Amino acid sequence: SNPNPFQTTLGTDAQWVVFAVMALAAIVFSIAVQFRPLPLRLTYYVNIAICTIAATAYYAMAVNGGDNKPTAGTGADERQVIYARYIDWVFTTPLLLLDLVLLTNMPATMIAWIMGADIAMIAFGIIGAFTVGSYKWFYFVVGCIMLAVLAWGMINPIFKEELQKHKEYTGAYTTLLIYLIVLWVIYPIVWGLGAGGHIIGVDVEIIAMGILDLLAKPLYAIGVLITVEVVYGKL
Numbered sequence: 715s716n717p718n719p720f721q722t723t724l725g726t727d728a729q730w731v732v733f734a735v736m737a738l739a740a741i742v743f744s745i746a747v748q749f750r751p752l753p754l755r756l757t758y759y760v761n762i763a764i765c766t767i768a769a770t771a772y773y774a775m776a777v778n779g780g781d782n783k784p785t786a787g788t789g790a791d792e793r794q795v796i797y798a799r800y801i802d803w804v805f806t807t808p809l810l811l812l813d814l815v816l817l818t819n820m821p822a823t824m825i826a827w828i829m830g831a832d833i834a835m836i837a838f839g840i841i842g843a844f845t846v847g848s849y850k851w852f853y854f855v856v857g858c859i860m861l862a863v864l865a866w867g868m869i870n871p872i873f874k875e876e877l878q879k880h881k882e883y884t885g886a887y888t889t890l891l892i893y894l895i896v897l898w899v900i901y902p903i904v905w906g907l908g909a910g911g912h913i914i915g916v917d918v919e920i921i922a923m924g925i926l927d928l929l930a931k932p933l934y935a936i937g938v939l940i941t942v943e944v945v946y947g948k949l
């Protein structure tokens with residue numbers, strides 16, 4: 715049990731690769747937005763911020779991970795805790811939701827509890843990550859309920875026309891949101907297996923979330939940017 719409980723060069727190498735891609739995406743988006751009309755630029759800026767924040771977090775993880783600190787647990791159950799990822803997520807996951815919220819007429823009150831659930835979700839994650847013993851799973855389960863809550867909120871503009879900007883946006887909004895929800899659900903699975911259950915090692919969790927992050931940030935961003943460009947170009 716508790717296999718490979720410390721970051722090695724394998725995990726470090728993976729983080730440097732994700733760093734490079736996040737940094738490149740930020741640079742590319744930053745050059746692109748210069749060429750686009752003003753109404754589109756906020757959407758580019760949101761995604762520039764997301765990728766810049768992720769790049770910064772991966773830089774920190776790649777530079778410091780080999781220190782093999784901090785840890786949670788003792789003896790045979792001791793495991794490295796990589797917490798920089800949560801600092802990334804508490805800023806980037808609301809921005810990722812904002813990408814889609816901007817396509818809707820969600821009232822402020824609604825945006826508020828969606829974003830609140832999102833932030834709470836990340837908070838429960840990092841608290842759980844440092845918690846030794848069975849109580850970690852209370853934080854985990856409530857964090858999962860928060861994911862359900864924010865997902866429910868994001869789903870409502872699909873079928874509540876009073877929450878829609880244009881009914882014609884519904885297809886793209888729906889498709890992007892389902893993509894998002896599918897990816898986001900994998901994160902607590904990785905957490906439960908790694909940070910929580912010590913079933914998978916640290917390098918493996920690093921690699922899994924590196925893949926998810928690439929899918930959930932720059933690739934997602936490209937989908938959002940294509941969507942707003944196509945929409946704006948037609949109305």
Ligand SMILES: CCCCCCCC/C=C\CCCCCCCC(=O)OC[C@@H](O)CO
Pocket residue numbers: 767770771774775778779781783784797798799801802805
């Ligand atoms: C005006 C700025 C707007 C953006 C807000 C800030 C964005 C956050 C930036 C990067 C997020 C993650 C960076 C946080 C850096 C975490 C440090 C770390 O990894 O420690 C390693 C351990 O070995 C030490 O105990």
Ligand SMILES: *C/C=C(C)/C=C/C=C(C)/C=C/C1=C(C)CCCC1(C)C
Pocket residue numbers: 803806807810835836838839840853854857858859861898899901902905927930931
């Ligand atoms: C760019 C980073 C992304 C999209 C990260 C998303 C992370 C989550 C959806 C995390 C979810 C979690 C839970 C639902 C339970 C508690 C543990 C977390 C934080 C991993």
Ligand SMILES: CCCCCCCCCCCCCC
Pocket residue numbers: 858859861862865899902903904906907911
């Ligand atoms: C829609 C939000 C629900 C997400 C629930 C995901 C739970 C997955 C847990 C599997 C990992 C358990 C490892 C012990």
Ligand SMILES: CCCCCCCCCCCC
Pocket residue numbers: 851854855858859862906
């Ligand atoms: C909708 C909430 C689902 C939460 C399920 C999380 C899985 C629990 C794993 C706990 C292992 C002790």
Ligand SMILES: CCCCCCCCCCCC
Pocket residue numbers: 896897900921922923925926929
């Ligand atoms: C759309 C589904 C994406 C699945 C990506 C999951 C990545 C983690 C599993 C692979 C670990 C090597």
Ligand SMILES: CCCCCCCCCC
Pocket residue numbers: 745748749750
């Ligand atoms: C750094 C060069 C990129 C800036 C190009 C500005 C384009 C503005 C013309 C629409």
Ligand SMILES: CCCCCCCCCC
Pocket residue numbers: 862863865866869895
């Ligand atoms: C009716 C309440 C539904 C809560 C879950 C939101 C949908 C998420 C699908 C995974």
Ligand SMILES: CCCCCCCCCC
Pocket residue numbers: 735925928929932933
């Ligand atoms: C825009 C870059 C998206 C890269 C996603 C690739 C994920 C799979 C890595 C093997």
Ligand SMILES: CCCCCCCC
Pocket residue numbers: 804805808809812833
């Ligand atoms: C629109 C970005 C919101 C970031 C929230 C940060 C909460 C600590």
Ligand SMILES: CCCCCCCC
Pocket residue numbers: 862863866
């Ligand atoms: C997850 C909460 C579902 C709330 C359903 C009530 C709809 C008005």
